[PDB]
């Protein structure tokens, strides 16, 4: 579970494990795929997707997911998590605002991202309905058995941990997690690399002038922009994405039927939608003479139909056609 710098972490820029990168309000189904720097899913070892492992300290905390909250302008709905990554059904929102509850603390993370949800169709809803026609939307999956893409996930760079740099009663005293690789020296001249167990520091004294580092590359990370490079190498760790964008047919929009009214080679149409509906036509002469107008306000319109025919498209309701001799 990677940890990075959340931008407006409740107060201001903290370093949250759930630091939000790559917000994708690019689908249609009320859904956003998000990456936390935290890797929830199974535990550290082997069990139960519905548990929760973020970083506390240098360490993980692979425990229950109890009170996740993604949210935006309104509280979102989770869809599924896998890896670093969560899918959640959100409404539109100027921002994105994520957070669980460990239990002692709220411990959330928030971010800017322009979000919208147009459904696919000539109706510009704000939200998916219960009914209407199905038609080919873009949307992310529920599932994990997924390989359609993979993002590079090589090592972490080092990280700071000044909990290490204690004092040896006059000298600044570094320690190690588990024998991990601590990269160490101070502004003064003393040990210059640091690949060690718990060292002391002969020369410097102040904690604030030393290299508290953790080369702990036993587990790779996501290659966040808010990661410091592991300077050594491009290690392996090519790793999939679960939530591929797929060609789901969203349960989708439908605009109320029109009121057809006859006139001489002319369609008066008293019209009354639910939401802004893009109407348009095609006078089937080799003179096309089409028309487009989003209609949200109910409006009686007109169409000079010709002899050979016109067609009529009340939103994603199917196209009509008309003989006006």
């Amino acid at each position, epitope marked *: 579970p990677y940890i990075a710098d959340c931008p407006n972490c409740g107060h201001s820029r903290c370093d949250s494990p759930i630091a939000i990168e790559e917000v994708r309000g690019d689908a249609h189904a009320g859904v956003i795929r998000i990456q936390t720097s935290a890797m929830f899913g199974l535990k550290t070892d082997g*069990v139960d997707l519905a548990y929760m492992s973020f970083m*506390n*300290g240098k360490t993980q905390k692979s425990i229950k997911i109890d009170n996740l909250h993604v949210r935006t302008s309104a509280p979102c709905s989770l869809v599924s998590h896998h890896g670093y990554y969560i899918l959640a059904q959100c409404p539109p929102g100027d921002t994105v605002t994520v957070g669980f509850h460990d239990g002692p603390n709220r411990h959330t993370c928030t971010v800017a991202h322009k979000v919208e949800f147009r459904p696919v169709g000539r109706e510009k809803y704000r939200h998916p309905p219960e009914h209407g026609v199905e038609l080919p939307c873009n949307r992310y999956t529920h599932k994990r058995a997924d390989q359609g893409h993979y993002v590079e996930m090589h090592q972490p760079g080092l990280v700071a941990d000044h909990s290490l740099l*204690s004092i040896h009663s006059a000298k600044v005293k570094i320690t*190690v997690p*588990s024998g991990a690789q601590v990269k160490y020296y101070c502004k003064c001249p003393d040990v210059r690399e640091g690949i060690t167990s*718990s060292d002391h520091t002969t020369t410097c004294t102040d904690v604030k002038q030393c290299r508290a580092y953790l080369i702990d590359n036993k587990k790779w990370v996501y290659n966040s922009g808010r990661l410091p490079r592991g300077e050594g190498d491009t290690f392996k760790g090519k790793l999939h994405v679960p939530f591929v964008p797929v060609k789901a047919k969203c349960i989708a929009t439908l605009a109320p039927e029109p009121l057809v009214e006859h006139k001489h080679r002319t369609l008066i149409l008293h019209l009354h939608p639910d939401h802004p509906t893009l109407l348009t036509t095609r006078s089937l002469g080799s003179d096309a003479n089409p028309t487009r107008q989003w209609i949200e306000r109910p409006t009686t319109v007109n169409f000079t139909v010709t002899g050979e025919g016109l067609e009529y498209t009340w939103g994603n309701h199917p196209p009509k056609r008309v003989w006006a001799q």
Partner: antibody
Amino acid sequence: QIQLVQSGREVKNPGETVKISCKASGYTFTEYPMLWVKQAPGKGFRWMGLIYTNTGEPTYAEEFKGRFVFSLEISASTAYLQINNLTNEDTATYFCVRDYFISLDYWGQGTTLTVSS
Amino acid sequence: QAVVTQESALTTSPGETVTLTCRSNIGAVTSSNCANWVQEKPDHFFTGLIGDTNNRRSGVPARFSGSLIGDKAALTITGAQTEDEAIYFCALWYNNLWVFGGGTKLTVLG
């Protein structure tokens, strides 16, 4: 539910080798590795290392890298401790243990070795 | 290369609340030390109580809870019982190995 039952206690003269078995019951062997702990007569409890019952890789505590060798009859849910070229100060009790829940949750009964001519 | 320290012996009476602590020689104990508490009853009988600081093993009475108090890991027995008379050992994780404390002999009236 979970039972780790260990071999019985041996006597061995200095220089010999011993293989102590730990037969696991109640869990899926493979998702939980094994801790080997030495509780020496006076001294108290000490971690000897851990074995990844999935891959098979052992970690030894530095005190134990050398004469000690962890292995497993995977197939029978057994983990084993082998102490070669027994030193007289290895008399003590060795426990197998399951690592789970950010610590150790179950301990075995113990197999006590008395190195003695 | 770290030394876990525990009280040597503690005596309480049935019904009382008693706290055992676990101190690390390198610094404050934190959640990344995953404090474990193990109990040894007579006959070389070991059971795990708490793991990862505050996770109670399954089938361990609720009178047992773990936590971090100050800079150390603590085990509280709330309503100690006669049955709780035993040796309690704490274990701390240090990035690559485990270090066990010396154990606390607890005596409970009964």
